[PDB]
Subunit: 296 residues, 6 copies
């Protein structure tokens, strides 16, 4: 077909945010939970809703054009196919601002953990054998792999393994099974990827247009509009504290020769630490306003 | 009573946004789902929560002062009462910015649709007989009406009708019953209406005050505060692309470009953002507005 | 088509129990909430899932064969069509054992001739009208299709005539139930025009199943010990579907064992009355299916 | 350890019924959704709550004693391991009375299907490549496999395949994606299985005891206690209509009829009830049985 | 008033079963979550739905007639009022068949527990200070009380106490907070209680009637109707396995065996069914009983 | 050591208590079953407890900070005082949530003219101490009936003649045929601290958090305003709009009679103020939200 094909997760932790991103990029569509393919009404785009496990392979095989997938799953599949002698490839278009999670080694609460060497020779249960293997090789630790495709935290209490390597964000399931997180081995986030084989000129131009929108949407979520007063003597430090998307606008203050007004757009979000550092450097009247849309 | 009476939908697609609008207009009230009448604590206003079907009639009969109702239901009921020889009347105060939907003719997926004439002589099932009738009369198409008050999309597969005229927004229920949308006949949105008979001077003044607030609230939702850089050579085009509530503020930059600050009349879609970039605009920032009054 | 068409409520208070009844009558089907027609896999039957409001009309117009509908909605619509000069008709096959509710006049907590001249708000104008005409009371009708209990506090009416089962919504709006005017339950109805012989025979078969399913829910299998001297009184306390089976008890000459199937369910009052008459070892077992 | 280990699905279509069966077999335990091992309080049994996909492998590897799994998943995994040169083995203890589903070939609604040969050379998408392969080999049909681990019904509309081989029970998801079921290739239900390597004498005796309970629970669900009146003349015919677990008890009632008490081997359907009446039976009572043991 | 007043829990672990019991005793009423007092339509009875904490006090003060409350809350409050010099009193009418739980001492998983003496001098956190105190006194153990009205399992990790005394049924919350149950100090269930001061003759007669119904309802839940075949030679052993006198019936054309019909006093567990089979019993049927009265 | 903050586990204050801490830059992972959350970026432990216990934990010095409703705080303070104890604490900040009131209510049918109508009545409440203090202050004798919940049942069930109950909406009162008649106490959530001095390091952390709390609350209330004002009306317009700082006044290019005013309001802008500004000749009034602010 002439229409651009984008694979996203049908249901799971990435689904809502994947749809939201596309929608905020002006891709109008009607999604019914039972329908596995949504057709955009205003753009030549088909959204395929599939299991996240299959997204890397669909992209590697060139059967969809774009995909939104967690880095962890993308790499685990890439490594697996490489280990079977294949040469999977893809283009990473953008690391996205959701799907944050980590892959961590965990042990029974009772165990005494001092360092990574404590895993030497242990049986380790995981749904991510390749990612675990690569990390253990890099650190020169021998172990016995036990692959489980789910319910990984059962393994120690059930004597299937001595430890686990599992995905975590909150920590809940670990506590419930008498386990403690001990070492983060991998950090992941959602990515937007593209198949390796060149698209048609028209499809590629549509991807280019979307990508500009994606960057815009993400940048608007992170960036803030900042207004503050700064002493002229401290301007360079203040700017170093708050990196901007462009050069700051500097305006004279009418009744005041020692200070200036600074208007700028931050590259990153403003945390209280930064607000406090700015005040320490002599900044005052600091205002941070939200931005709904932007385009550099 | 001396208190102003406003009828809104108890529960349904208009309920949340009807309450939100009143709340954003400074009408403080405590609503609980089981209570059918909420009394405003800061203004002399009673909110009656009723079935949307009855709102037009309550207004026509002059028994409430204001109502928020979908256009589709308002006119269907107006037309129905006219067909019984009555003379319903009301004042349309404002078309609102929610309750968007459409009434559409639909056919079985298998049917070949070329033009409206393909509906000649067909049996058409609908919950909106009057709206359908008026549209078919305007376009000179004869048909057989089949009134169903719900589950309209069953009619073709159940051989109650050859086609349907139904409310749609998403399209889901049509696919599930092997139907395709083929012609939009009516587009609807929520409206704020008032009874025909004059109110007391005090009540009318309260309505006037609320109306100004309604316009403000709606404008603040649509309008955005825009900041961008524009080449001086392209300002006229840039301003045409983005109509404003007032004239833009133009500020010199620390050369051949200027800074433009303005308030858009409408919301900024990506197409506009892209058209501005094409015309040479850069550093385009769009900030939300919480309240406004010209 | 050759297939029998049954209209039931898509979603609402009658839906679950309508499907259950058909299912317990051996009508196998797969219902998906979004699908508005279910086809029976084991019988030539189509289930049309519609709004309850339309079921009477579909039956009156002969466009479906059977329907399950609340009596209240059935007669309200019958009366409405009669008032427009039409002559709706149907066959009442069976009053069912669910959908119980009542239509009641209610007044503000603070307050039949007392309704004389009052404004009365209702979603059932025809049923109210018929009742008020029968009792010779003049009133002013106010039709509301929902939220009826708002009317008094909102000064739309002086009283209401509304559907109730629990009473909750009345208390919440400072109203009290004052007079029941109509009692309703779900009914199974059929169109007036004769069916084909094959369709009618299928309906006849279903009807016997419906009766069986309902009787099994009400009837219980009863075993007890009774003194021979009190046997007549005990049998009078417990009407049965058949004559009781009477069995001698080993080594007890004054008493007998009684096994029977009750026509109605056994309430504690009956259990206590049986004990008063000298019955002992009373056992009540549930029945899953029956056919007399 | 001395305790018997049983693997069941953590969450999914088999979970509720797996727990119910064990509970009805007198295995007391407290399951918290977050806890992946439940310890029986009254028997030496550990319930491991896992992903269904892993249950066959845990059994093949002898690392749990019992498992409750769908036949489809069991044989798909058995076949997969055989294709890698392994020799997986297990004992099938009992086919259970839930988890009913089927694996079926399906095509777009528009396609003309006459025979299995119409699948010749087609791309077929499935989560059950091995089961599909075995069936296609048995019937001598060449095809191209496309493995998808979920959302299989997307494949045709997305041009990933020409057809699918997917699990169905209702049919809903097929309609929603413009597909029609065309050929059932495999029928499945939940099974209770055991590892191949011999258990201790104590563990095996516990399994034996549980198995008799499983059979009892399943028979009690199917069997009913029946009481009816039959004419003495029609007696032979009535018994033939109603196969029992034992011979019927016949009791005198007046002189022309008898009372019949019996336990049915199978459940009583309305057809049987109606056949009995036709043969002259009356006062037919069917009572539920909560527990039984032959 | 002339009407009998019964206090039950509005919402919580006892609420559903309290209502069910009354309903199964033929008390017809319409109970809506928003309504705090339900009036029985068929009997002169008012159901007050309150917080369980207050039920003992309402009974002690003679302000309601009956109450359904957990033993633990009843005695905790009794003890508390006694410690303030009051003399609370009540009549225990019946221990009921729901609301089962236990009050248990628990420690961090890491702690070595050998005996009760290990609690000597510890800080113990509990919502049931009086029940804990009575138990620690009866055993001569000194400790430091820490009263928390909820979230008791936080205390050790938060260094508010060294141990806890908390309500448990399913040990979930203990595991989640790295705690282990180590000594049950008190076992509880729901009870039906009555105020001490004599009721009117009419009210007391109504209570008497309800009590017989309560006993009947509970017995019907436990008792089962049993039918089996037994060898005449094993009849005594079989009857000893199954605690009124059984009905013994001859089997037609079988002289070595008899049919036994019994109503069990207790429920039949698999152990008993297996023991019956071991003694030569066969065709064992257990049917449910809906109502009974001796 | 680590700073200990007690908040409500689940209830009306729980969400907003967590949100406030989160908006103050306290990062933490809270799982509903977990009763103690450890901040990942600051030395802070969040204890999730029953609100009833928070005052006592603070009084006893066993946690450092607490977020609790005023009503529960003073009810417990009063209760402990009545047992001869001397509970004490520091009130750090009245917060912008947990708004409710304690009110006397009567059956709808009763005729209420004055507080004296409560003389000698039986009054049911979960807040005996707060009621007692109010009734003593106003010299009214009554009979207390303590109920720990379902207070609105008491009149219809003849447990009392009246109630003193927490309300925000009036829903539950209507449902039980009661009317609110006199507000006796107004409450909101408070952030409190134990009386005994903290270590210098812990106190400095509290000081830092407090400035953040004030910032977060100010950003919720304050708005960024832009408008046009006639030069002749500037003084009146500024009086209508108290600001956090002095307004910035800018000339308008094509217009000599008017100026542009940019400012940050101290309070939120209600329609009344917008309308008053317009009445005074202001035009093009824009109100933008503020996400964070520091003076
Ligand atoms: N707490 C979390 N927050 C954000 N993202 C997460 C979190 N946990 C996991 N993820 C990411 O989301 C991805 C999908 O998670 P999810 O649990 O929905 O996948 P799944 O269980 O494999 O679902 P399916 O296979 O049915 O698509 C993970 O691979 C990971 O990249
Ligand atoms: N998808 C939609 N989005 C927004 N508004 C809609 C949509 N569909 C319909 N509406 C509007 O909302 C009105 C009410 O629809 P809704 O389904 O809430 O009430 P209803 O079906 O009439 O139910 P009831 O009569 O019981 O309140 C419609 O008449 C129409 O004006
Ligand atoms: N407590 C009750 N209140 C109202 N109706 C009841 C009640 N109990 C049973 N019914 C029966 O159920 C029928 C349908 O009630 P329900 O509220 O489901 O339908 P509805 O309000 O007409 O909605 P719809 O128009 O969507 O089918 C009533 O006409 C009545 O016969
Ligand atoms: N309609 C159905 N669709 C799919 N499986 C069904 C159906 N009915 C019964 N089953 C059975 O249930 C088993 C488990 O299905 P389920 O969808 O719960 O697991 P899953 O999708 O593999 O999820 P998980 O991997 O989390 O255990 C299937 O292998 C099958 O044997
Ligand atoms: N696992 C359990 N945990 C606590 N109480 C239980 C448990 N099982 C049964 N109960 C009984 O339920 C009673 C209280 O139940 P529940 O926890 O619902 O009320 P509550 O928490 O005291 O709430 P309220 O005080 O608001 O009524 C206990 O006093 C006890 O008798
Ligand atoms: N409408 C309201 N009703 C009652 N309390 C409110 C209300 N609004 C705010 N609150 C505040 O929230 C506090 C706790 O409310 P909530 O009812 O959640 O706790 P609770 O019922 O005492 O539960 P727990 O004791 O189990 O924490 C009150 O003490 C009060 O300060
Ligand atoms: Mg996955
Ligand atoms: Mg409507
Ligand atoms: Mg209806
Ligand atoms: Mg699976
Ligand atoms: Mg309690
Ligand atoms: Mg509390």
């Amino acid at each position: 077909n002439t229409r651009l094909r984008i694979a996203i997760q049908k249901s799971g932790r990435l689904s809502k945010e994947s749809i939201e991103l596309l929608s905020e990029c002006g891709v109008k569509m009607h999604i019914h939970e039972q329908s596995l393919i949504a057709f955009s009404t205003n753009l030549p785009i088909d959204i395929l809703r599939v299991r996240d496990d299959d997204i890397p392979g669909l992209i590697f095989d060139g059967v969809v054009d774009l995909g939104i997938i967690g880095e962890n799953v993308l790499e685990e599949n890439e490594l697996e196919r490489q280990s079977l002698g294949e040469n999977p490839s893809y283009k990473l278009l953008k690391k996205l601002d959701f799907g944050y999670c980590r892959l961590s080694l965990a042990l029974p609460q009772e165990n005494k953990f001092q360092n990574l060497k404590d895993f030497e020779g242990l049986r380790i249960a995981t749904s991510y054998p390749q990612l675990l293997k690569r990390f253990m090789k890099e650190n020169g630790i021998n172990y016995k792999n036990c692959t489980l495709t789910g319910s990984v935290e059962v393994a120690p209490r059930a004597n299937l393994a001595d430890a686990i390597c599992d995905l975590v964000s909150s920590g809940a399931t670990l506590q419930a099974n008498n386990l403690k997180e001990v070492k983060v081995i991998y950090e992941s986030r959602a990515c937007l990827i593209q198949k390796e084989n060149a698209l048609s000129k028209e499809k590629q131009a549509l991807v280019d247009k979307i990508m500009l929108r994606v960057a815009g949407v993400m940048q608007a979520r992170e960036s803030k509009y900042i207004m503050l007063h700064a002493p002229k003597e401290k301007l360079d430090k203040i700017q170093a504290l708050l990196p901007g998307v462009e050069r700051p606008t500097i305006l004279p203050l009418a009744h005041d020769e020692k200070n200036v007004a600074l208007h700028m757009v931050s590259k990153e979000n403003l945390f209280w630490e930064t607000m406090e550092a700015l005040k320490e450097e002599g900044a005052s009247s600091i205002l941070v306003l939200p931005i709904e849309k932007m385009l550099k």
